[model samples]
Target: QIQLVQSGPELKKPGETVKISCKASGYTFKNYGMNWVKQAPGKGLKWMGWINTYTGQPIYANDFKGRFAFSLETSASTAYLQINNLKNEDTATYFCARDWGPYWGQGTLVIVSAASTKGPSVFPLAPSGGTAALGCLVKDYFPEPVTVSWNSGALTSGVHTFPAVLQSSGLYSLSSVVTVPSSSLGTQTYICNVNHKPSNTKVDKKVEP
Candidate 1:
């Protein structure tokens, strides 16, 4: 019969801040800690961290340090997460969960936008050569959607693309790989291309054989 109630959605812009709250009832809330989670569009869920409700002590994930914090109001049986200095990358749905089992609150969707956001930093390299896979790791860009391409082949033919993942900061990270023959290594040149729609910025990486 435990119930976790959460706050409503929020719309924020870059450099701004937002606070989300979760109220727990039907249970001894103080006996259990609260954990925060994040989910971005088309990305896997992330565990931000948790706060000990009884003791008011907080622990953050490696990526959640600095501007991210978890706090509680034991008197009211509630927990909170505050995010400051917001970026477009911070846009996502957040959830509060009880430390015990599967008890969870409804998520709060935070939408963050910008006039123009930076393009993703693209790093394309051959992880291994001579019949190995060539990969491009693209990170730190916003707006949910991105396009990745290779110069020589269809993205579906000799290539495998992983789904884009959302970092805690709200930007998306993705990796794409292609199988290359040994003869092509050290002799052929390849190009990795990324297009971020928000800013309409395109970046490329030229890999030498």
Candidate 2:
């Protein structure tokens, strides 16, 4: 298991730039890559790029080629994010992404308080309680659409559904409720499995109601 923690908020003026950092803990440092993202206040987030810690190589996305770099300190087991050409528009909470479905940061909030403090919102919690509304939560969606299935005790077929798209981060998550009889309670486990990029399958079971 690996945990990624991010540095604090940053405030910079237009044309001025700053660098934020994401630290790794609880696992081997070089085994996984560190992912960085950019989100403006009150806007959608963008996938900036990723860095291979062991090789010290950064693969930047099309928009983040310049003024952005990812670095790692293997000895300290930490990864650093350096962004330059500071802009008033660059004020947003940066995140260090994890590989699996659940290892990403809780999200750090950053804003140019001197200016305006707004940006794409972090992911909200999945709504619960109900049989008709069957929902699931996914962090990032890539490669393809994920699947959510329901099993009724001995039967494995229920319904086919897709995860929710994160309007802010452009990721995917889900929550679904159903309106079935009380007898259906705890008879099966609703598994939300995703076979997509940046994430794998996640299984969550529901206990007897």
Candidate 3:
């Protein structure tokens, strides 16, 4: 049952380091060289190059040259991808394939987050006849998975959260809206919490209309 099993997802901050491993089983380690591929969401597959199983020499694509490293542990039948000083756009799934073959590993996702994810920007809307709305904008996050909750999920009614948008800066942007009674516009207060899991931090902004 020749198989290539890769390690699970990895979370790392900017300037950090990460190593993804692919273990080959039920097959001769040197039968075929192992190649690497990068698969980013919405982007087509990008080949990262391969390592010669017979000689232990690694070849990297031009774009993957700097900060990217490939190594192996012949005794364990494992090939590894060591990435240093990860950047935001480096977030993606990496797959290891058998040389000149179709066999591939499950692929591991590496998330690159900002050192300290920025906080959400809260915007209060003027009160209407009986209702008022508030908006929260979160930016500079990574991995595109964000949590935008109103009042810590306590206020779900009239809440509209838009999907996260990818920014040219290699970060993510998300917006959320909430509606409240006109009576609470200037007196009552609410919160918009932005959760950036990969960064291990969150931001809470007051929504006072």
Candidate 4:
């Protein structure tokens, strides 16, 4: 039941702007933050910012805010990223990383296929040669069809992602995960998120050899 899927690809032109969305499923809308990421054409990704699902406060990096805005729809449980005054340098791909590095989107490719359209994408990274855990936690209900993976290994349940049948006080509970050691940490990141709703907020850490 847990799922975090993103909207489709797009093209924007220089001086123009566009908005993207990441929708969630199987979890409470106010329990986590909505993360947004950016990538350049033919290059890697960079963290843009994140919006608090409950408070609507946004945390953005200097490199991410020239013309970017992050927001969310608490009623719809969807997160969004908008870019304004698009430039040729804005062409790239974009992604939504879940909290703590666990869940993820399929990577939306934003190409400046037109003189007026732009595209961007983002992918987090991991450490190499140590120990780490990707954590995903929820307040009321856990994830449905919940699962986790580390280093592209098989999915896991329990501390990472757990779905319970019994409800406490009629409210649901939720959690899920994927973990890997430093030695196995690749260029990819470890994300913790509900499969249904893609929070798109993740923390990327690299391990030293």
Overall lDDT per candidate, in order of appearance:
0.82, 0.58, 0.81, 0.59
CA lDDT of 183 in candidate 2? 48
Mind giving the per-residue lDDT tens digits that candidate 1 earns over 1-209? Answer: 78899997676788998999999998887889899999986699999999999998999999988999788888899999999999878989999999878899989988787633657888866544357678788888765467878884544568777888878886778887788777766766667777877667787787653
Prediction RMSDs, each to the true structure: 10.5, 12.1, 6.7, 18.3
Give the higher-lDDT candidate: 1 or 2.
Answer: 1
Whose TM-score is higher: candidate 2's or candidate 4's?
4
Strongest candidate by TM-score? 3
lDDT of 3 by residue, 1-209 (tens): 88899998787888999999999998789778999999986799999989987678999999998999989999899999999998989989999999766689998988787534443443443334787778777766656567778777888888888988867976677778887777766666778887766666677888553
Q: Comparing 1 and 4 by TM-score, which wins?
A: 1
lDDT of 4 by residue, 122-194 (tens): 2232222356554544443222222334333433433344554435543334444455554554554454433
Candidate 2 CA-lDDT value: 0.58
Model 2 segments more than 4 A misplaced: 112-209
TM-score for each candidate, following the candidate numbering: 0.55, 0.51, 0.58, 0.52
lDDT per residue as tens, model 2, 1-209: 56777775554556665766677889877888778877775678799888888898989999887888788888887778776766555667787886656677655655442443222111212223344334344444432345544443333344434445545644444543334444454553444333332233445544233
Clashing pairs in 1: 89-169, 89-170, 186-209
- Give the C-alpha miss distance for residue 142 in model 3, angstroms: 9.0
For candidate 1, the per-residue lDDT at 86 reads: 94
